[PDB]
Write a protein that holds these residues in place. Structure first.
Motif, PDB file in Angstrom:
ATOM      1  N   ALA A 125     -41.481-120.641  25.233  1.00  0.00           N
ATOM      2  CA  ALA A 125     -42.664-121.524  25.415  1.00  0.00           C
ATOM      3  C   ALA A 125     -42.768-122.789  24.542  1.00  0.00           C
ATOM      4  CB  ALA A 125     -43.636-120.565  25.441  1.00  0.00           C
ATOM      5  N   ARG A 140     -47.884-124.079  26.403  1.00  0.00           N
ATOM      6  CA  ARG A 140     -47.597-122.640  27.326  1.00  0.00           C
ATOM      7  C   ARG A 140     -47.644-121.506  26.480  1.00  0.00           C
ATOM      8  NH1 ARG A 140     -45.211-123.372  32.671  1.00  0.00           N
ATOM      9  NH2 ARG A 140     -44.737-125.788  32.763  1.00  0.00           N
ATOM     10  N   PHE A 156     -53.711-122.512  32.938  1.00  0.00           N
ATOM     11  CA  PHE A 156     -52.340-121.917  33.667  1.00  0.00           C
ATOM     12  C   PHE A 156     -52.127-122.839  34.851  1.00  0.00           C
ATOM     13  CE2 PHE A 156     -52.966-118.229  31.253  1.00  0.00           C
ATOM     14  CZ  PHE A 156     -51.427-117.887  30.899  1.00  0.00           C
ATOM     15  N   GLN A 207     -50.543-126.152  33.894  1.00  0.00           N
ATOM     16  CA  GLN A 207     -49.053-126.052  33.988  1.00  0.00           C
ATOM     17  C   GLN A 207     -48.104-126.111  35.109  1.00  0.00           C
ATOM     18  OE1 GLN A 207     -48.068-126.414  30.800  1.00  0.00           O
ATOM     19  NE2 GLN A 207     -49.950-126.657  29.724  1.00  0.00           N
ATOM     20  N   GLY A 256     -47.548-119.808  36.189  1.00  0.00           N
ATOM     21  CA  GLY A 256     -48.890-119.813  35.662  1.00  0.00           C
ATOM     22  C   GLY A 256     -49.718-118.736  36.679  1.00  0.00           C
ATOM     23  N   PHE A 278     -42.916-118.148  33.103  1.00  0.00           N
ATOM     24  CA  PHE A 278     -43.955-118.999  32.790  1.00  0.00           C
ATOM     25  C   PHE A 278     -43.783-119.763  31.578  1.00  0.00           C
ATOM     26  CE2 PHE A 278     -47.995-120.586  30.466  1.00  0.00           C
ATOM     27  CZ  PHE A 278     -48.299-121.376  31.527  1.00  0.00           C
ATOM     28  N   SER A 279     -42.967-119.243  30.531  1.00  0.00           N
ATOM     29  CA  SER A 279     -42.471-119.665  29.362  1.00  0.00           C
ATOM     30  C   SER A 279     -41.252-120.814  29.585  1.00  0.00           C
ATOM     31  CB  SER A 279     -42.125-118.631  28.214  1.00  0.00           C
ATOM     32  OG  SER A 279     -40.875-118.192  28.653  1.00  0.00           O
ATOM     33  N   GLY A 312     -41.234-122.794  32.262  1.00  0.00           N
ATOM     34  CA  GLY A 312     -41.523-123.710  33.578  1.00  0.00           C
ATOM     35  C   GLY A 312     -40.796-123.591  34.436  1.00  0.00           C
TER      36      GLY A 312
END
Length: 375
Positions: A127, A131, A188, A191, A199, A244-245, A247
């Motif tokens: 991340a 993030r 979130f 992002q 997110g 999510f870490s 992208g």
């Protein structure tokens, strides 16, 4: 086994600025008969536990540590504070009578860099700084709202929990705690507009985590126990956080990834139960914890072993088989040419979670207590 040498050989000399000092060395296999078992760049850097004398009860060799862990502790202390002070959070009590305010205060008593958020430094190491801030905040949500599904919707905890759910979905006077909760939710969403769609999935799995009632305690097989433990360890949430870490936009539920990811879930469950058995066995033997629910115990019963030590050895055995299966399944996926760069990136980070779960469980205070302190 010296504090000075471990923190010397762990990371490259180049990265000592961002390095996070290691203060414990817990061996949960210390008294287990395991002579027959053998275990042989912008946002993170390599940790090398092999090159120390740290207990390394795994055949994984890639471990990583997040660089921006120092900058990530703020939003999660903020939430821990606001939860400790909120009036409703003081009246919102679990089945065992403990309130949410009490949970946050008890975790605020721990030192900033050794709270349950430290997990993210090793299991979500990829991340970036913004993030990582949001993931560390969701780890506080996991701590606070654990077992909140037990209460009725009309109990005080049920209302805070269902209020929390509605903010996570998107739906007067807003308390300061709700304000911060709204911001994390907005964070979130921001992002996702930048990159990736993980997110909102992290929030969705937090909702699922607050509503999914676990599956009882009759474990006729270890598969039955690990199906419950995948839910209990909040595994769908953890995959959302990995995605999510990065992208990433990978479909975590693609059936092509299902077998390797259920293996990874089995690994995380087995490691975590191995690490936490001593603690969970003491909490049952002195009465503190009501039950003992742990793969080591399930294995002791199912394979009729004399003590927990043999059970730990059989459990570790099956953990080493899960690791062999994971490498075989990943090699097969790479050889079949059926993985994008993005999927391979996701699976590599899934493995970083698995190895990082081992590392955090060796070097944290959480499972070895004070005996495992280094000098």
């Amino acid at each position: 086994l010296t504090y000075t040498e471990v923190n010397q050989n762990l990371a490259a000399r180049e990265n000592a600025s961002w390095f996070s000092p290691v203060r414990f060395a817990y061996d949960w296999l210390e008294d287990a008969p395991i002579e027959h078992l053998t275990a042989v760049n912008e946002n993170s850097f390599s940790i090398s536990p092999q090159l120390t004398g740290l207990p390394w009860p795994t055949s994984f060799t890639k471990v990583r540590q997040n660089r921006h862990w120092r900058q990530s502790l703020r939003i999660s202390t903020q939430l821990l504070e606001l939860f400790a002070a909120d009036d409703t959070s003081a009246q919102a009590v679990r089945r065992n009578g403990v309130s949410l305010a009490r949970i946050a205060s008890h975790e605020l008593q721990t030192d900033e860099e050794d709270r349950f958020t430290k997990f993210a430094t090793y299991i979500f190491p990829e991340a970036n700084e913004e993030r990582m801030k949001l993931l560390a905040a969701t780890i506080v949500y996991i701590i606070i709202f654990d077992d909140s599904w037990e209460m009725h919707s009309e109990d005080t905890l049920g209302l805070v929990r269902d209020d929390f759910i509605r903010r996570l979905r998107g739906d007067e006077h807003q308390t300061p705690l709700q304000q911060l909760i709204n911001s994390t939710v907005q964070g979130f969403k921001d992002q996702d507009k930048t990159m990736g769609n993980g997110g909102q999935e992290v929030l969705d799995r937090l909702i699922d985590f607050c509503e999914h009632v676990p599956p009882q305690t009759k474990f006729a097989t270890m598969g039955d126990y690990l199906s419950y433990r995948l839910i209990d360890v909040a595994f769908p949430y953890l995959l959302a956080c990995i995605k999510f870490s990065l992208g990433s936009s990978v479909n975590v539920e693609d059936p092509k990834l299902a077998p390797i990811l259920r293996l990874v879930s089995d690994h995380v469950s087995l490691v975590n139960d191995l690490a936490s058995y001593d603690k969970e066995k003491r909490a049952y033997d002195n009465g503190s914890a009501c039950y003992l629910i742990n793969a080591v115990d399930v294995a002791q019963r199912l394979f009729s072993l004399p003590s927990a030590a043999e059970a730990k050895a059989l459990t570790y055995s099956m953990q080493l088989l899960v690791e062999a299966q994971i490498k075989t399944e990943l090699d097969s996926l790479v050889a079949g040419g059926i993985l994008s760069c993005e999927e391979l990136r996701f699976l590599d980070a899934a493995l970083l979670m698995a190895s990082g779960n081992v590392f955090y469980s060796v070097v944290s205070s959480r499972y070895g207590g004070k005996a495992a302190k280094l000098e």
